[PDB]
């Protein structure tokens, strides 16, 4: 089994990559902007199943991790939650989030790398982690997921939505990302102290695309 | 088994790394300048076994691949060969090679990345490839070794000297290098169309250090 070292360069390259990504919906999606509508439709449906009623997540506060300009906040979180906070390492995306989300400007915008971020203690009903876990190493993802657990209000949930490789991991040096497989991802979730409440595979995506999964964790 | 993509970024990072490496012997060795003397002593001994006499390599021309400033050219090749040529992607190291090798200046200095280099046809008695194969991907190393084969004069040899992992490969993102193991390296050599004439393990190195091997190929 292969050993990969150079964490500092792994993170430094993701910053150089996102420095040239446009602060637009198309830049957030990559080469798959036509996939934003079915991505959003599936998230809204999956989310609703775990919110409202006794023992389910509340609707006061949500956290959008690796938010970018706030694509998930706009179409998924802001319609459901009274207040939504955004966390992203890129100041550029957080500034554009102000125009993209059409807010007065003007606290809800956190500029931190997730591996250096502690979600405020018991603040959130829902913590959303979409298309960003792949940018964290196995060690940093495990520690971040355990910290997200303490950021949860009573009956709060973490929603992890990402690419899940068929079998075997895929490392991409261009954007410094890892496409984990189901075995590796479930291990990290279990080790962080989280349990899977539910899971759904993203439908409506072309057969060529790597499978996309949704997990409800607590 | 893991899939690694992003060749362009893999090569782009090695250039950024060598841009900050000093054009000195200490910079060529890394954090192991005290290891240059036993490295040189072992190379001189290994080389002599495959040069001179019927059916062995001649002594007219040698090529130093990933030469740097010409550490191997200075202490190994220039005492044996009538003329020695250097190939390195870094112009900085090739310019310093002029002062380091104490030459008039002032054709013998080739500024090319090995994966974009074709050793001149049947020009060399010996082609030296030391502490650079790790910077080539498996595909580019295989193709380069097959091209080195055509750069060889009759009875010429390729001397490959590098770090060989115990079992399993080690990828280092900081300098964009791979420490191949014996199984992977021997496969690439066989696939390039080369056969092993001889092999020796580098002695006199601390127990902590990754094993260093020498191969005589043709
Ligand atoms: C593919 S975009 C996804 C944006 C958003 N989650 C969506 O679904 O539209 C990845 C985002 O993660 C952010 N990011 C990448 N690595 C990060 C890290 N280690 N810490 C924080 N943010 C990071 C990037 O700045 C970018 O906004
Ligand atoms: C560790 S230094 C070794 C220098 C020399 N072989 C020695 O033993 O002193 C690695 C050298 O390979 C060069 N190099 C790295 N990747 C290269 C590539 N793809 N093509 C050509 N030269 C490369 C660097 O510029 C540097 O001079």
Author numbering:
A (entry chain A), B (entry chain A): 59 to 164, 167 to 278
Per the authors:
In order to unravel the molecular basis of the substrate and product specificity of NTMT2, we determine the X-ray crystal structures of NTMT2 in binary complex with SAM, as well as in ternary complex with SAH and an RCC1-derived peptide (SPKRIA). In addition, NTMT2 contains two auxiliary regions: an N-terminal α-lid (η1, α1–α2), and a β-lid (β6–β7) inserted between β5 and α8. These two lids cover the core domain that contributes to the substrate recognition. We also identify that N89 serves as a gatekeeper residue to control the entry of substrate into the active pocket.
To determine the molecular basis of different product specificities between NTMT2 and NTMT1, we solved crystal structures of the NTMT2-SAM binary complex and the NTMT2-SAH-SPKRIA peptide  ternary complex. The NTMT2-SAM binary complex subtly differs from the NTMT2-SAH-SPKRIA ternary complex in that the turn of the β-lid of the ternary complex is shifted closer to the catalytic core, which facilitates hydrogen bonding between substrate K3 and both D232 and D235 of NTMT2. The co-factor SAH/SAM in the ternary complex is nearly superimposable with that in the substrate-free binary complex. Based on sequence alignments, the N-terminal methyltransferases have a conserved DxGxGxGR motif located on the β1–α4 loop, which is involved in the SAH/SAM binding.
